[PDB]
Amino acid sequence: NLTPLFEELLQQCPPGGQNKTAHMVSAYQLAQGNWMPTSCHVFMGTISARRTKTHPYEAYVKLRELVEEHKMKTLCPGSSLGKHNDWIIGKIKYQGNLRTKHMLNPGKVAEQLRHNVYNKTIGSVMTATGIRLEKLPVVRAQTDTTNFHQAIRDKIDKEENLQTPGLHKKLMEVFNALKRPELESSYDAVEWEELERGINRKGAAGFFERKNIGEILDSEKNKVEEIIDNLKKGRNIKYYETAIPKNEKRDVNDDWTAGDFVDEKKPRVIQYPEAKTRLAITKVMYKWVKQKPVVIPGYEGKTPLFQIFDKVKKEWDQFQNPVAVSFDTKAWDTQVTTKDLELIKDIQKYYFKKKWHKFIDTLTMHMTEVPVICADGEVYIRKGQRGSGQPDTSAGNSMLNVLTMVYAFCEATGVPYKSFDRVAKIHVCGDDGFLITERALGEKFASKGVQILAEAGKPQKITEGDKMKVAYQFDDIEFCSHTPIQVRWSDNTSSYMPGRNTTTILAKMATRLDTIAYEKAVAFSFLLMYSWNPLIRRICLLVLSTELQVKPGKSTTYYYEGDPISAYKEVIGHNLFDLKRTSFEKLAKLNLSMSVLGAWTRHTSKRLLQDCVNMGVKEGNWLVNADRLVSSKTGNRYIPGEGHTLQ
């Protein structure tokens, strides 16, 4: 009866190792009585206990006392600064004002010297149909400096999470089972041309950096190569990261993205090393941080969003009663421990050539304890954790996440590490992800996994009944802020597309953070993902019919060469005209938020179709005739030119 209070309390106990020297009892076992707790040091949901005719309520109180005693005996151990970073001291000009409780705020340096706006064409397309933009949810809002200081105190300002003893030994036991020995010690850095190929010249400037990436590349490339050598030999350098709030002017991505969802998952606190330091890290570790080739099992950072759910359902279909168990770690970046970072270090040393291990052993040391500069000049010393702007973020988090989840899953079920790829499939993109396995294993892992994942220091989001999110049918999987939605093509074949709430799609489509060429690029980018949504599909076509003489802009996720309907068929595998049905039920779910907020009218759907037909019945070759129902209504079809989709 009193069993849950033990389970909730067990999520607060310090991680311990196997203690065979005493009796280790379960949370349900404690609720049965005749058991008095002997230590709040917990291991796999068990604690050392003695049998002594106890009342349950007493056992909890002794545990509450055991835990409270330790909490007031293991708080403020103390923050220390590493010598290799002493150089930052000489830069303080004023006293510190962060009022941090767990990390040093040694002072402030001297300072140096964006709005949410609507896309004029798209927005005029929506409004003309009765969509009320004001009713759409806010997206990509910025935050004030006072919330920023409190945000850092709220989420960053935390000591490293305690982890189970010897864990990283076990995590290496898992990695050895999925190493790719045909590549051991085979990675080398790439040359300047390969690095500059896929790069944004507008890469974010450091706090002490004046020039962007494109400027740093065009003129100070020699400076970057100097950084590498000092690291190549194990020499300290001026490592610092700049802290700005998400959607500040310098929240700019160095590398390509798969969609707007990546920006949505960025923490409230963006932390990145200098443009020059990022370039040095990227030129050296290119094959890792960009996962070329992919050696992280189930890493979907390169999988385009329109492929992922087709790719997964092919795995889904091979199980007897599959479930998908979601990973939902609370603010992952703040939970990377120092010991976790050397686990990636020891892994990066595995795949890199012998001539770079000193580089890695050194750069890890800096990342063990990083000096960070706020936008306003306040300086704090972060104990470990992952900076969202580091080049190793997605690569390092992803490989970190798989090992951690496999450990939690395998130890929860009894499945041996070497047998995993046989009884389960996993897919991750940074901290977000899930695993597929049989309902038996999935329900077992989902119930015990929350506590185990607390013992490894990756606490999950508080959920109902302390159980991980379990998907029992395919299109309930949630991944990368999207979810599978079925479509049936004209040839009676089925595929899945990335589904998402209609409200969210409209908002992210109608806005930007501070031209008509751009809006056609957005229209195409959204069309590749959301052609299942008849509202979006037709809005997108209308924008594409707008001033056909203009070429599409190239600043966003995708753009097209030539006729766009061809580009759709090139990557999707079917012509847009072949979309005959969108999954009936799932569309109802995703459109509900539209009616919840009242963002549309009872005739909005019809007014949009009727708006598209008006442009479509006129004689000639019109984009809107790609829509099967529009073409069914106009009697004419769209005949595509040549087309190609490019990033």
Residue numbers in the entry: 13 to 125, 131 to 531, 538 to 670
List sentences quoted exactly from the publication behind this structure:
Compared to the RdRPs of other Flaviviridae representatives such as the NS5 of the Japanese encephalitis virus (JEV) and dengue virus (DENV) in the Flavivirus genus and the NS5B of the hepatitis C virus (HCV) of the Hepacivirus genus, the pestivirus NS5B contains a unique ∼90-residue N-terminal domain (NTD) that does not have notable sequence homology to any other viral or host proteins. The global conformation of our CSFV NS5B structures is consistent with the recently reported CSFV structure with an RMSD value of 0.9 Å (95% coverage) between the reported structure and our representative C-682 structure. These structures together reveal that the NTD adopts a globular α/β fold with an α-β-α-β-β-α pattern. The NTD interacts with the palm of the RdRP core intra-molecularly with a mixture of hydrophobic and hydrogen bonding interactions. Collectively, these biochemical data indicated that the RNA synthesis fidelity of CSFV NS5B is fine-tuned by its NTD through the intra-molecular interactions with the RdRP palm.
To better understand the nature of the NTD–RdRP intra-molecular interface interactions and whether they regulate the RdRP fidelity, we designed point mutations at the Y471 and E472 sites in the context of the WT NS5B and the N- and C-terminal deletion mutants. Crystallization screenings were performed for all the NTD containing mutant constructs and four of them were successfully crystallized with one construct crystallized under two different conditions. Among these five structures, three of them (Y471A and two forms of C-672_Y471A) maintain the WT conformation with the NTD–RdRP intra-molecular interface maintained. The NTD–RdRP intra-molecular interactions are fully disrupted, and the NTD is rather involved in a non-intensive three-way interaction involving two symmetry-related neighboring NS5B molecules in the crystal lattice. These structural data together suggest that the selection of Y471-E472 mutation sites is valid in perturbing the NTD–RdRP interface, but the interface may not necessarily be fully disrupted by some of the mutations. The effect of E472A mutation was highly consistent with AA mutation (compare lanes 4/8/14/18 to 5/9/15/19), while the effect of Y471A mutation was slightly smaller than that of the E472A and AA mutations (compare lanes 3/7/13/17 to 4/8/14/18 and 5/9/15/19). Although NTD–RdRP disengagement, a situation mimicked by the crystallographic open conformation state in a crystal lattice or the N-91 construct in solution, results in fidelity reduction, engaged NTD–RdRP with perturbation from point mutations can achieve similar level of fidelity reduction.
